[PDB]
């Protein structure tokens, strides 16, 4: 019964790391892409300087 | 035409530049979000469908 209770607590709380192994890599790639998009969005306004 | 008070050609060029800037902003949003439809403004039907399925 104690083994069953521990197995049930593990079913309740334990994460499935095998999907996290891919989610982490995709999240780091998305972070890099987001930094690039924010940098381009920062660069965009300053092209008005060419008109003056 | 040869007027110092108005510049229709700069107005048309400004319209084209505003259009290309808006398309670049949409591309920036698709890059930083990774989604064709990230919010209800992008497309309401597919957004409601994907959200109910999620």
Query: Count of CB atoms within 10 A of residue B37's CB?
Result: 17
State the structure-solving technique.
Answer: cryo-EM
Spatial separation of the C-alpha atoms in residues B42 and B53, rounded to whole Å: 18
Q: Determine phi and psi for B41, rounding to 5 degrees.
A: -65, -30
Spatial separation of the C-alpha atoms in residues B43 and A42, rounded to whole Å: 27
Which letter does DSSP use for residue B6 in this model? -
CB contact under 8 A, B28 and A30: no
Number of A/B CB contacts below 8 angstroms equals 19
Spatial separation of the C-alpha atoms in residues B26 and B47, rounded to whole Å: 17
Which one, of B15, B52, B27, lies nearest residue A40 by Cα?
A: B27
Which one, of A34, A32, A42, lies nearest residue B30 by Cα?
A: A34
Which letter does DSSP use for residue B42 in this model? T
Resolution reading in Å: 2.5
Sequence-distant (6+) residues with CB within 8 A of B21 are A44
Q: Which of residues 35-54 of B touch A (CB under 8 A)?
A: none
């Amino acid at each position: 019964l104690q083994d069953s209770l521990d197995a049930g607590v593990g079913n309740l709380v334990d994460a499935d790391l095998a999907k996290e192994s891919a989610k982490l890599q995709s999240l780091q790639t998305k972070q890099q892409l987001g930094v690039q998009a924010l940098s381009i969005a920062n660069q965009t306004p300053q092209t008005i300087l060419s008109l003056f | 035409l040869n007027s110092i008070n108005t510049n229709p050609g700069a107005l048309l060029a400004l319209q084209n530049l505003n259009s290309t800037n808006t398309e670049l902003a949409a591309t920036q949003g698709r890059i930083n979000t990774g989604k064709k439809v990230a919010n209800a403004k992008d497309n309401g039907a597919i957004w409601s469908m994907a959200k109910m399925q999620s």
